[PDB]
């Protein structure tokens, strides 16, 4: 890996007002160079591989360490990696890691939980086509005005989505389910 080539590539994205950070324009540019829409799951997958702390933020350390471990000193080398990252998420567990990372990436730094409509946005993206009851779930949350989602409720929603049946017949009340998922089963059962 040519470090000089990687340092100049970083210079293309860095904030004109802060050398140690990539700004909103630099994040947009990086997506454009990767031929990616900024609302694509592939942008979230890249954030996951670069292990970015929070959304709308990208540091020098994250970019440099990310590209080094991937062995990319160019955009074309990184674009060649995107189908390899998508393939790796076919593995449950790699997807569990990615899904759980999404909570920490989306929430505000300093805050322990994720705001409801922010969690719904990301659920719509990451649980797209892999949670039958997503429509009812969002409806239930927006209706019973739950302000924020706790880490364990977000995390156990994946366990719920992979274990639950179409009729919810295999759901166990005595199971280690958070009150929100448990209340959702009470609300949803008459509707299916
Ligand atoms: C789907 C991609 C994604 O998460 N996009 C984020 C913005 C990004 N931040 C980073 C940071 C680093 C990197 C590196 C390349 C690794 C990439 C990105 S893309 C977003 O707009 N996320 C929105 C929600 N956010 C918002 O609506 C704005 C949130 N505010 C911004 C100001 O500070 C407080 C939080 C999405 C839109 C798409 C569907 C899901 C909800």
Numbering used by the authors: 60 to 251
Q: Could you pull the original sentences from the published paper?
A:
The neddylation cascade begins with the activation of NEDD8 by the NEDD8-activating enzyme (NAE), an E1 enzyme, followed by the transfer of the activated NEDD8 to one of two NEDD8-specific E2 enzymes, UBC12 and UBE2F.
In the present study, we report the discovery through structure-based design and extensive medicinal chemistry optimization, of DI-591 as a high-affinity, cell-permeable, drug-like small-molecule inhibitor of the DCN1–UBC12 interaction. Comparison of the co-crystal structure of DI-591 complexed with DCN1 with the previously reported co-crystal structure of UBC12 complexed with DCN1 showed that while the majority of the amino acid residues of DCN1 interacting with the UBC12 peptide and DI-591 adopt very similar conformations, the F109 and F117 residues adopt significantly different conformations in these two structures. The additional methyl group of the propionyl group in DI-591 fits nicely in the small hydrophobic pocket formed by L103, L184, Y181, A106, and V102. In addition, this propionyl group forms hydrogen bonds with P97 and Y181 of DCN1 while the amide in the soluble portion of DI-591 forms a hydrogen bond with Q114 of DCN1. The cyclohexyl group of DI-591 is half buried in a hydrophobic pocket formed by M177, A180, Y181, and L184. This co-crystal structure provides a structural basis for the high binding affinity of DI-591 with DCN1.
